[PDB]
Amino acid sequence: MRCVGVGNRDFVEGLSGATWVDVVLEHGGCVTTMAKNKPTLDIELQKTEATQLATLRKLCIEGKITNITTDSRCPTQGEAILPEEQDQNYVCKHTYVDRGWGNGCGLFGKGSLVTCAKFQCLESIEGKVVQHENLKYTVIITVHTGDQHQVGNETQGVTAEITSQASTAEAILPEYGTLGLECSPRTGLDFNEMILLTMKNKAWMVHRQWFFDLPLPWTSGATTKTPTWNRKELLVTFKNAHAKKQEVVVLGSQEGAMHTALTGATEIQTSTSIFAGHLKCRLKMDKLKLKGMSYAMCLNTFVLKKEVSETQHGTILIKVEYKGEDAPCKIPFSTENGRLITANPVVTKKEEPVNIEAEPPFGESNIVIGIGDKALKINWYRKG
Amino acid sequence: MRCVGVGNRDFVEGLSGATWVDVVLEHGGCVTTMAKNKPTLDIELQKTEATQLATLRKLCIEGKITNITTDSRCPTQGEAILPEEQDQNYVCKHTYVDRGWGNGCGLFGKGSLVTCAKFQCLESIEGKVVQHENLKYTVIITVHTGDQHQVGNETQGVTAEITSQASTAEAILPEYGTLGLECSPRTGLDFNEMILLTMKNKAWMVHRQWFFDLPLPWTSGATTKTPTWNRKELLVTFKNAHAKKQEVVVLGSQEGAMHTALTGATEIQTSTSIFAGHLKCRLKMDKLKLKGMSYAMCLNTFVLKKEVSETQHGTILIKVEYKGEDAPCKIPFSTENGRLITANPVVTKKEEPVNIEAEPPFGESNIVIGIGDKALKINWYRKG
Ligand SMILES: *[C@@H]1O[C@H](CO)[C@@H](O)[C@H](O)[C@H]1NC(C)=O
Ligand SMILES: *[C@@H]1O[C@H](CO)[C@@H](O)[C@H](O)[C@H]1NC(C)=O
Ligand SMILES: *[C@@H]1O[C@H](CO)[C@@H](O)[C@H](O)[C@H]1NC(C)=O
Ligand SMILES: *[C@@H]1O[C@H](CO)[C@@H](O)[C@H](O)[C@H]1NC(C)=O
């Protein structure tokens, strides 16, 4: 009863006689499966993960400038040159300035000037690549056992891992047998065309070309404590207004600009990186066995321990307490179209209440729980 | 000789007989004025300033979030409400979540949830308005005196202030008289349509509508230590992915985004705010008097104290030293089309050299400085 309370909940019933049920799990959704003489299951796709990621390119979003140097020449003395022009850490620019007697040259004319600034990246973002061969899907299965605290509890449930290599897996359901999962991980997208952009805590999924065409300084994917940046001029600007001076300034943090650019992109939790995805599976229930089919009927009384309330999908939840000593026994259930969602409701201990999910028909109907005169009669109306 | 060495230099000569010269000064430019029997002047527009500015609107570029509160209700209990919804410091959002037995409600259905976050701006930018009634133009005038250190020296020169109210002004030129400035401050742009955007040290001139349509939280121009921001949701986002949770996060610094948006805008030095502008003036030289017109000629020798060099505009600079005792005297100057830029070159002291700017004709010409056999003869060729 994990999906009881989830709005995006699907009910799937297997074909007549078949012991297999085909389901489509998607993020934020829950599917309830029913089969004749089989336990009612609540299956959910918990998370979709990428296990190991290789960084393709690394982009600088905030940088600073240090160790500025400059060299100037008088007219007709040739272009000025600095060794830092061949240092890949520095960004340099050549220009011409007005030179004459007033500024220390014998000749009047245009004199060469060159400025170099060492560039250091303060904050960067990464673009890691995801290949579907490394994707891991985690599925969670919860049996409708009637357990006391079962309704909407995300603590209990058996998890099973599906990978592109290990697509079929078996999940051991305690006291109910073994479930088969024959899933086919359909990519949903071409992963070469998409790149995982990670910035600080946050992460997104963006187009490869869009990431590569980001107007930011970039460096190879290989991590280095001292990296060599290209396109450093996309953050460093040289200004020479009136041929007197040349000042170099850095562009400032592009963090918020990236946030705006990432508005229309799919966002991903953390940077453990969990995707929002889907997965199609075939559930083999041949090895699944209903726990209390061989139990006898409960000969005593049931008492309502909680008000009957309606689910968003029209089903009702009944919490009953048994007052007899023959447990474990089968709960007598009959409607005076009316069916059960929970298959084979049973009492395990007298002290523990039982939760039953039922699908009453539209209109007035009488839910009879127990047998005989002392049976519980709950009148109910289902309005469409 | 302030413009000697400036590349953007204009030469203007007054009409025949007139004692007035019309000039157009613009930022980064220098104009040299000549008139018969009048001192040669080097006029320049130093700066254009706005004296007092009123802030129209103030926009937040970086904010943070504190004191988050939230309230939730079970289904059919009505919409949740917080008092912080009526606090203008908080940004709030209403949503609906899945509620049922599992999360503490007796009824299954959609339950109301409301979240509020107190917003605080960390960094802001201002949009101050400039009206042409407060503009101040500063003009600098430098006489061609022949002074020892006059070439390109920006230390010497008389400054005069022109304002839209005080358009005509008089500038006292020591030893040369009084200059009249009849300027007409033409706006160049409609100042209501333009707003001065100031961010940290930097400032720009942008369109009013563009500034008002900036997607940032804004507040009135009046300065307050505790301001009230509008459009706070332009920096604060609420995320509710699957009807389980609602997390509130701030957008981050928009500083670099603003820098990119301001790429095509005119930049202004500091935030003392100096514009790049122009000014048209009429120079009245009726009260200007040439210092040494009544001096006698220099009867002795001149010696070249520095190599003759050519200016970017074809003129030549001659630095001579006088070796006689009759100073002050008129320097004999003759070409063997050839004219002087510096009007009435004179020797003031024997120990101080004299700088003369001359315009030699194209081709071969002989510059004769001094009189007699002992006169200085400098051969020169001007190539076009
Ligand atoms: C770079 O310049 C600064 C100038 O303050 C100096 O401290 C530093 O030693 C220089 N070199 C390196 C490698 O930091
Ligand atoms: C949820 O399940 C755990 C596991 O048995 C149980 O201990 C807990 O009390 C339950 N709580 C609920 C349903 O609130
Ligand atoms: C806001 O919340 C914080 C919670 O840490 C608290 O310290 C503070 O006193 C609260 N109110 C104000 C006015 O800061
Ligand atoms: C510039 O002018 C000042 C003012 O007389 C003078 O003291 C200085 O030596 C000059 N320096 C130059 C032209 O380098």
Residue numbers in the entry:
A (entry chain A), B (entry chain A): 1 to 271, 274 to 338, 346 to 393
Article passage:
The human monoclonal antibody C10 exhibits extraordinary cross-reactivity, potently neutralizing Zika virus (ZIKV) and the four serotypes of dengue virus (DENV1–DENV4). Here we describe a comparative structure-function analysis of C10 bound to the envelope (E) protein dimers of the five viruses it neutralizes. The neutralizing antibodies induced during a DENV or ZIKV infection target the envelope (E) protein and, with a few exceptions, are serotype specific. The epitopes are distributed evenly at the surface of the icosahedral virion, which is composed of 90 E dimers organized in 30 “rafts” of three parallel E dimers (Kuhn et al., 2002).
